[PDB]
Amino acid sequence: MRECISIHVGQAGVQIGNACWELYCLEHGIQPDGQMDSFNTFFSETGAGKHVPRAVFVDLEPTVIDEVRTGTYRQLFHPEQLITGKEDAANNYARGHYTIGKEIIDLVLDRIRKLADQCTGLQGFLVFHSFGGGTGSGFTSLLMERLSVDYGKKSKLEFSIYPAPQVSTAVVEPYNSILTTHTTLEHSDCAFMVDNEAIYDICRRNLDIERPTYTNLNRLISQIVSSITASLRFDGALNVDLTEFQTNLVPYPRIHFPLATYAPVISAEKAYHEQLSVAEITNACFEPANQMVKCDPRHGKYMACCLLYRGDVVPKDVNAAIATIKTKRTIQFVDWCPTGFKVGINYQPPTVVPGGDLAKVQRAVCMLSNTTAIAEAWARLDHKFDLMYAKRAFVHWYVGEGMEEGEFSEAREDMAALEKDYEEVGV
Amino acid sequence: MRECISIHVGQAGVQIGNACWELYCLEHGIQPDGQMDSFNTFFSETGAGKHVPRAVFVDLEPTVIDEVRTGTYRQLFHPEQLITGKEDAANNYARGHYTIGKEIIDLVLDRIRKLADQCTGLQGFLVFHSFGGGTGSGFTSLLMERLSVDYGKKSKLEFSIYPAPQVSTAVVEPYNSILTTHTTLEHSDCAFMVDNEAIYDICRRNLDIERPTYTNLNRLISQIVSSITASLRFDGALNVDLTEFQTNLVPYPRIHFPLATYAPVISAEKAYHEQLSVAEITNACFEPANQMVKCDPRHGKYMACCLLYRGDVVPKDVNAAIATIKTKRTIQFVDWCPTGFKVGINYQPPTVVPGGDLAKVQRAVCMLSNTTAIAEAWARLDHKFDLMYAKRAFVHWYVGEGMEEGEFSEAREDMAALEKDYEEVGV
Amino acid sequence: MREIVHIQAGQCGNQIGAKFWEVISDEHGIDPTGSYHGDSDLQLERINVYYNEAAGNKYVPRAILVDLEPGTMDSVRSGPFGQIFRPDNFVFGQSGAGNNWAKGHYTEGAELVDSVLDVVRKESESCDCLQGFQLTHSLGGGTGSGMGTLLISKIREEYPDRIMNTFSVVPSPKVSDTVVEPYNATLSVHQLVENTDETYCIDNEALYDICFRTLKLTTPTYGDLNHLVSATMSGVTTCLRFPGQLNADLRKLAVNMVPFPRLHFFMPGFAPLTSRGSQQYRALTVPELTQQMFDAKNMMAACDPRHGRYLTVAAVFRGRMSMKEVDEQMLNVQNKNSSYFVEWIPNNVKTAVCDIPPRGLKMSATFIGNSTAIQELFKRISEQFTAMFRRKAFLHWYTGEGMDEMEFTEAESNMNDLVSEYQQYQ
Amino acid sequence: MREIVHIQAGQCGNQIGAKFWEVISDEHGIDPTGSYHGDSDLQLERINVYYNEAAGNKYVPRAILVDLEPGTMDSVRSGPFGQIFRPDNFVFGQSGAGNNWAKGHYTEGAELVDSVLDVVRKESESCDCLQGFQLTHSLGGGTGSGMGTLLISKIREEYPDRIMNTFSVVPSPKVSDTVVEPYNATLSVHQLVENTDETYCIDNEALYDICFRTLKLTTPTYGDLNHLVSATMSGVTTCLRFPGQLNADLRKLAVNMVPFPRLHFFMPGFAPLTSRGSQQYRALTVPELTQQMFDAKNMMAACDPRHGRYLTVAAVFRGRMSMKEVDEQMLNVQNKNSSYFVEWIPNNVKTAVCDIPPRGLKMSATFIGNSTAIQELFKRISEQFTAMFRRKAFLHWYTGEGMDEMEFTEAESNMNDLVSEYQQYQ
Ligand SMILES: CC(=O)O[C@H]1C(=O)[C@@]2(C)[C@H]([C@H](OC(=O)c3ccccc3)[C@]3(O)C[C@H](OC(=O)[C@H](O)[C@@H](NC(=O)c4ccccc4)c4ccccc4)C(C)=C1C3(C)C)[C@]1(OC(C)=O)CO[C@@H]1C[C@@H]2O
Ligand SMILES: CC(=O)O[C@H]1C(=O)[C@@]2(C)[C@H]([C@H](OC(=O)c3ccccc3)[C@]3(O)C[C@H](OC(=O)[C@H](O)[C@@H](NC(=O)c4ccccc4)c4ccccc4)C(C)=C1C3(C)C)[C@]1(OC(C)=O)CO[C@@H]1C[C@@H]2O
Ligand SMILES: CC[C@H](/C=C(/C)[C@@H]1C[C@@H](OC)C[C@H](O)C(C)(C)[C@@]2(O)O[C@@H](C[C@@H](OC)[C@H](O)C(=O)O1)C[C@@H](OC)[C@H]2O)CO
Ligand SMILES: CC[C@H](/C=C(/C)[C@@H]1C[C@@H](OC)C[C@H](O)C(C)(C)[C@@]2(O)O[C@@H](C[C@@H](OC)[C@H](O)C(=O)O1)C[C@@H](OC)[C@H]2O)CO
Ligand SMILES: Nc1nc2c(ncn2[C@@H]2O[C@H](COP(=O)(O)OP(=O)(O)OP(=O)(O)O)[C@@H](O)[C@H]2O)c(=O)[nH]1
Ligand SMILES: Nc1nc2c(ncn2[C@@H]2O[C@H](COP(=O)(O)OP(=O)(O)OP(=O)(O)O)[C@@H](O)[C@H]2O)c(=O)[nH]1
Ligand SMILES: Nc1nc2c(ncn2[C@@H]2O[C@H](COP(=O)(O)OP(=O)(O)O)[C@@H](O)[C@H]2O)c(=O)[nH]1
Numbered sequence A, B: 001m002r003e004c005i006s007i008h009v010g011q012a013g014v015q016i017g018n019a020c021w022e023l024y025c026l027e028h029g030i031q032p033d034g035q036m037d038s039f040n041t042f043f044s045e046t047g048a049g050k051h052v053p054r055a056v057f058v059d060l061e062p063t064v065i066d067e068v069r070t071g072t073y074r075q076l077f078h079p080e081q082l083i084t085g086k087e088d089a090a091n092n093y094a095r096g097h098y099t100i101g102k103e104i105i106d107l108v109l110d111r112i113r114k115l116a117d118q119c120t121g122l123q124g125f126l127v128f129h130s131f132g133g134g135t136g137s138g139f140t141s142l143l144m145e146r147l148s149v150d151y152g153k154k155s156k157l158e159f160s161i162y163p164a165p166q167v168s169t170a171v172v173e174p175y176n177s178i179l180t181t182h183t184t185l186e187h188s189d190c191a192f193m194v195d196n197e198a199i200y201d202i203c204r205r206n207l208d209i210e211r212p213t214y215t216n217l218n219r220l221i222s223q224i225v226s227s228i229t230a231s232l233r234f235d236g237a238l239n240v241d242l243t244e245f246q247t248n249l250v251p252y253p254r255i256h257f258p259l260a261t262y263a264p265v266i267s268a269e270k271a272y273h274e275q276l277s278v279a280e281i282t283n284a285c286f287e288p289a290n291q292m293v294k295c296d297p298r299h300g301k302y303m304a305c306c307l308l309y310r311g312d313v314v315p316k317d318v319n320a321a322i323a324t325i326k327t328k329r330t331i332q333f334v335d336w337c338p339t340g341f342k343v344g345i346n347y348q349p350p351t352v353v354p355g356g357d358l359a360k361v362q363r364a365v366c367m368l369s370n371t372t373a374i375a376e377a378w379a380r381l382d383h384k385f386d387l388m389y390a391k392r393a394f395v396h397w398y399v400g401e402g403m404e405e406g407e408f409s410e411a412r413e414d415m416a417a418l419e420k421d422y423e424e425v426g427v
Numbered sequence C, D: 001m002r003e004i005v006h007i008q009a010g011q012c013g014n015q016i017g018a019k020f021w022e023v024i025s026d027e028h029g030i031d032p033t034g035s036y037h038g039d040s041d042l043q044l045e046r047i048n049v050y051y052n053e054a055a056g057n058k059y060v061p062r063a064i065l066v067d068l069e070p071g072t073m074d075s076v077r078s079g080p081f082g083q084i085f086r087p088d089n090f091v092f093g094q095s096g097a098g099n100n101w102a103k104g105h106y107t108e109g110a111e112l113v114d115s116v117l118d119v120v121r122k123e124s125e126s127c128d129c130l131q132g133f134q135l136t137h138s139l140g141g142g143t144g145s146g147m148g149t150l151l152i153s154k155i156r157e158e159y160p161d162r163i164m165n166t167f168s169v170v171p172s173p174k175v176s177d178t179v180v181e182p183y184n185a186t187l188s189v190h191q192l193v194e195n196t197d198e199t200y201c202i203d204n205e206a207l208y209d210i211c212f213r214t215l216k217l218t219t220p221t222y223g224d225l226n227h228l229v230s231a232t233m234s235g236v237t238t239c240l241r242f243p244g245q246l247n248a249d250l251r252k253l254a255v256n257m258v259p260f261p262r263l264h265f266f267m268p269g270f271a272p273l274t275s276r277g278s279q280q281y282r283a284l285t286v287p288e289l290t291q292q293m294f295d296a297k298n299m300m301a302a303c304d305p306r307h308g309r310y311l312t313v314a315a316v317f318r319g320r321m322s323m324k325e326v327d328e329q330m331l332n333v334q335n336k337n338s339s340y341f342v343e344w345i346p347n348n349v350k351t352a353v354c355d356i357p358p359r360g361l362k363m364s365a366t367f368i369g370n371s372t373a374i375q376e377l378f379k380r381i382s383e384q385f386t387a388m389f390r391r392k393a394f395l396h397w398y399t400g401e402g403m404d405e406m407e408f409t410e411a412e413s414n415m416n417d418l419v420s421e422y423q424q425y426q
């Protein structure tokens, strides 16, 4: 069957993974200890009955994984799936890659191989990292490269924490992200990217919450992930396998970045002041502020769009909605693509956790989008990098562990090329 | 179906809207929480069964809407339909328009669009403001202008709080009202205007009440509104749709102002000392003091009259009454209009709220009137404005936020033109 | 053969229509769901004239309901006999007309009319030999008036050899019922003069007079008025549905009633009209019936026929009667008061008779008058029109939908010419 | 004799297939486990056409289920009528196609197709006289589209003298349903033009229009769409399974419907199509049925047939009917509207009839149209293709599996030639 493995790497990735696992447990009826039909896509079938997931959990930081190992979702995990080392990169690309990561990576590969050995049709991977964080950027890149050698035909999807233009966390992100882009590019297939500023905005407006945490964010991410994956596991009108997200979303083999957005993301309060019909949901999906990154999508033609409807969904309504969207003048599309939309309709609805603010909905959607409008963010990032690098800010740290500066230049060139390609596409 | 939206803007407007909503709840059987046939004209059909109105609630004043949000008619409303900001204009036309309103207006427009997206035949709007109050005059004008761009074919009816000649509230009304007139004129279709002095007079004589409030006034207004609208919702002998009040009431495309008057407005005491026959009601409607503005209608020819009979009504009787009215020498009519009266007869009677003084009547009427007799009030207003403006009273406030003084002159010119037109009509 | 397709347009048209279908149903022994429960084979002989047959001995009105204004037709549907109509024969839009002929005839109505035409075509195919189309509408509204005219134009274009008859509710000139009514009426009349073979002109004022003065009644409702109209309508087509001595037909009536092609505006009446209470005070002699028929107070148009000459008159009787009595009565009427019938047409009257009285009556009769006096009605309308149009009052509502001033002028001109023509034969 | 082997390919193909097997089961009195519970010997006379017999009076679909994508077929198996299929007739792989024709036709599909061929061969041996193969698939996917084409190629190679018919779900050109859909559709069409004798072209847009405009329905599910398809499918083969007056057959239909070898793309329809609610409003006359059949709004391809000429049309009726009525109806249709049927073929229509109405209906009919208008469909697809291919958009996914640019070009060329040919006879 359509049966697969996940990868959660670095602090952020691990956090996301926890949430994901919780969501999965809710969905498939599994109790935190492994006790309870088609669950087995992730949870490789087990000895005494108690289910155990297929996820690679990696952190060179001990602390986050240590927390997990003394949590509630604890015995659920295999000891080995969770991996440990000694110290952070500390936002240092030249440590996940090159120096310290080239040591653990072998172990990770072995684990992955072992996991694969249970599949009877390994459709691919899901990878969780951060365009920014030191471990989950260099290390993840390295891992992806390794996988490329050992699994050429298998899809490798990535869930990515792009840094928002204005807001920041650690002031060496512009280097790290760029480096990741340079070395991820050719080894991944798809990189689903979500900002944090956008999420915060959504929370403030749509969910009516002005005091968020990371936990909430993680839950939201997990929801999206679930939406993406549910066609593997449950039945459906139209089933979108992992390998479709290659072919209905990558118009050219360097453009690997889609924006992942969810709806309806509205709390219980003015949910009952709403219909929550299919058309409305679709409309919400294409609006600017509901997107989970900081693009003005009205500034950029859509290349490929992909929608994953869940729950009580009649295809006719969906079709109507899509037609309406097509009709709209502001939702721009490329010169070379008429069949812009890819639709998945799944008989199982989304499932809501205790503590998760998003209330119970009979129907919901996850949208995946490729556009020239992502290029703005890239350009901004490039600019940031250039401003940093001319005065040689913090270069000696990465170079002092094991790097050429020409690498940086190469990365910049690559970015420029990407930009040019985007421009061409727009034309 | 004939299915539509309302707009309630500014303090006064919001107050009126509350009353209106209460009345609607009474009429259609809806409980304050949304629980219970043809209600759905306003109350767009809902998810779990509990009905939610289609009204735009706007106040740059937080306080009034805050009160509503902690009232009884509370969960009934959608959170978004009610809108908030920060501070009043403070009877300052140059803040609803120009400065502060151009900020919220977009949101309001969006809301309106969303509401429209539920209609299967949006017949138009109902707008509640004040010729005088700072928010609901500039802001409302702005809103109307915006709507004109986004809905050209859709009717936009307005319910208006004209300031009475002698009595006043805030001593910058003469500016604001004039400004509103200048910028409303070409974007609205109809502006149903009600004074307060007239209402008070009615209360003193007809209802036998000498200690009124705003609440009572609001209730009265709501009654009128209900009478206006009931042909959309319930069955009838003759059904007057919103779009009829364009075509049976606007003889020329600048004359957009009718007087809205109601009968019988008599309490339980000397109701039983009365027959309350159709003819009597009709007679009451055309009498001077029962009118809801301060005109002497005997000083002015009628252009178009429109009557909306409700309850136990036989058309023959109505016809007889109309004939009698026509016969009368004092009820003057224009040289150019023979078919002066437009009649709507509705099988559903009016419905009385607990607390509302007007007792239960098997039959009742609402009358709408265009005449040269409205021009007197306009002239008075103009005079007031001119007296104010020559010594430059409070001009620096509006000008100091963002205005030309030439605007004032333009407004005055417009008023003069209107007056001239009225004179011509009279001829 | 002899099959009729019915169209009802606008609010009035629909309401009258409902009553008409009730009455016809009753007459043909059709129950409110559509089952036959008659005891006479006479009832089904020519049932095809109004009803199509369906599986399970179901009978369905050959009837089309049109309104741009939705909700009026919903009321019809909700009603008792609403369940007899074919759901696919409800054609409706999502916007009213604001009593605007231009919106009915030019813009909004044009968007809906295709559907109606399609349905009409479909209906036509189930006629062995289509007699024609029968329309119910009102002048003074937007849909019945404008869209009705539009539809009539289309249908005449497609079926010019079939008869086009309209039961049209006109204004009450002494107490008018909308503000733009004169504009609408004038615009419609133009269209009807050219594109119909006969128009039955019914006015509510006359109906109320009938109710009050003649029938001795009070509290009359629109329902009651509709009843009266429906009775005349049914009377008109009796000879297509049933046996008799002299059998009428649509074109036969037109042949005897329209001596010049444009003079086809009729004043319909019914008799007997006496009180329900004072029943026994009177009886049913043919002379009495004819008296009732011919008396001005018993007509349903807003004329004094005594202020003009009759060009022609058709009387349609129901019940088994002495033809001698009939003819002789007519002759006496003509002789005694020859001044009220134009002297240039020998034998202005016409008789038809059907052996089958409706429900209660032993003897009933329907009156169809074509008098020069009807000029009065048109004259008053033109007066109304002119007073407004010379000041271009309310005109912006129509020009805004693409109508031109010139059209209005031309319509007025045509109306005036009609009046002139009527005056000629006076 | 006259035995048919059924193949279902891909998700769509399997889903439609399930419905088809339910419907056929019902028709032949087979219960969900495979026992016969009919009351007529007519039911079993030619049951062999679709079903093999097994020990214990068990009947088994002569049906093969193929999907490289596993899990869709598991749903089928889990379903109610899933238990009727032979477990050995499920052929499935362990990898999806990502809506990739190249993976279905060249690489992944090539690895699975041997098994399918083996099963097909086995199936063929239990035919007394194999009529042919009937396939259900979709264009726009990878398995149904690519692998379906592959399988068809193989089967034609091995059984070139047996008839190859495909019920193929094509795109909805106004609102397309995948991104690479145009590529897939274009690639498949190339194969089908050359390697099948007839292809029934069904599009979801048309189905939804039928549901909404004609049947007056809402909330329609894929199940409902499948139902509609299944009904047409069953109608197509009725004359092989049952008695009648004029009995059709696959090649007979092909003989009357394919006047040039490559023009074998049909628009299927069913009649009657009216609302469930408004049943009594209409009845079952042959003329009404034919009207329903012939009206554009009632067709299941995405054309206005009025924008082209009919090359040929086959109507297959079920129910005991007047042949006079049938023939005369056809004649009238041709005479009245001769412009819509190409004048170079005298008698463009064909009739067949079977004495055995399906479940509820007394009279049912299946429509098969071959119109020059279908050029529109191909034209739009080619437009879609060109816009992408001129920028080599999405092409790397296909070249990566060994497909060459030249092939794409050639496919486009062939499609264009098809269009040109259709235009010739317009
Ligand atoms: C006890 C008795 O004999 O009662 C009579 C009756 O009193 C009188 C007054 C009836 C009555 O009619 C009215 O009062 C009336 C009300 C509104 C508008 C017009 C008339 C009667 O209601 C009407 C009714 O008419 C019929 O039955 C005809 O078949 C008539 N039917 C309908 O109009 C009808 C009413 C309800 C439901 C279905 C059909 C008809 C006439 C012409 C063509 C077809 C049908 C009759 C004779 C009577 C009553 C019942 C009191 C009269 O009218 C008719 C149309 O017959 C009024 O003057 C006549 C003389 C009748 O004698
Ligand atoms: C009380 C009654 O008479 O109900 C009818 C009915 O109301 C109508 C509306 C049926 C109904 O069909 C649909 O509503 C429909 C739903 C989805 C897609 C397509 C159609 C009916 O469901 C379908 C059903 O059809 C059959 O029984 C045929 O044998 C049909 N069977 C199936 O499709 C089938 C359904 C479920 C399970 C197994 C088989 C068939 C048609 C062609 C070839 C073989 C079989 C019938 C007549 C009816 C209902 C039950 C309401 C109609 O359809 C058919 C195929 O007959 C729709 O228009 C026709 C006219 C019928 O009168
Ligand atoms: C022939 C066409 C015809 C012309 C006339 C004038 C006809 C002739 C006669 O009827 C046939 C009159 C009739 O014989 C009567 C005297 C019994 C009587 O009915 O006359 C009317 C007044 C009369 O007009 C004066 C009436 O209105 C009317 O129309 O009369 C009062 C009435 O009170 C009970 C009664 O007294 C018009 O269509
Ligand atoms: C013969 C092949 C054929 C050609 C034509 C045009 C055929 C002929 C006739 O049907 C057989 C039309 C038919 O007689 C009607 C008029 C009753 C009717 O059905 O026509 C359609 C519109 C018509 O196209 C205009 C239709 O779509 C159609 O296809 O018509 C509206 C419909 O509303 C209820 C009704 O009014 C195409 O396959
Ligand atoms: N959405 C989300 N973002 C997170 C979370 N944790 C960290 N981040 C984001 O990830 C980025 C920081 O990377 P981390 O994952 O913390 O870093 P790391 O991978 O552990 O790498 P080092 O600590 O540098 O070795 C910042 O942009 C954070 O906002 C989380 O739980 N959820
Ligand atoms: N009938 C009625 N009139 C009211 C009500 N509230 C205020 N008014 C009248 O409205 C005018 C004042 O305008 P408001 O609506 O209070 O002012 P606003 O729109 O809030 O504008 P600012 O307060 O100036 O920002 C005065 O003429 C009041 O008498 C009410 O509830 N009913
Ligand atoms: N006799 C009769 N007149 C009606 C009826 N309904 C409305 N009217 C008259 O028709 C005119 C109003 O037009 P109406 O049909 O309601 O407007 P529409 O829906 O725009 O065509 C007025 O003169 C009314 O008195 C009815 O049921 N019977």
Ligand SMILES: Nc1nc2c(ncn2[C@@H]2O[C@H](COP(=O)(O)OP(=O)(O)O)[C@@H](O)[C@H]2O)c(=O)[nH]1
Residues within 6 Å of the ligand: A237, A238, A239, D009, D010, D011, D012, D013, D015, D016, D069, D097, D099, D138, D139, D140, D141, D142, D143, D144, D145, D169, D170, D171, D177, D204, D222, D223, D225, D226
């Ligand atoms: N009519 C119909 N269309 C379907 C069904 N399932 C999928 N589709 C359509 O088939 C196309 C998608 O291809 P699908 O068969 O699911 O992909 P595959 O499994 O790769 O062949 C789309 O146009 C869908 O609308 C079905 O059950 N019925």
Ligand SMILES: [Mg+2]
Residues within 6 Å of the ligand: A010, A011, A060, A061, A088, A135
């Ligand atoms: Mg870390």
Ligand SMILES: [Mg+2]
Residues within 6 Å of the ligand: B010, B011, B060, B061, B088, B135
């Ligand atoms: Mg305020």
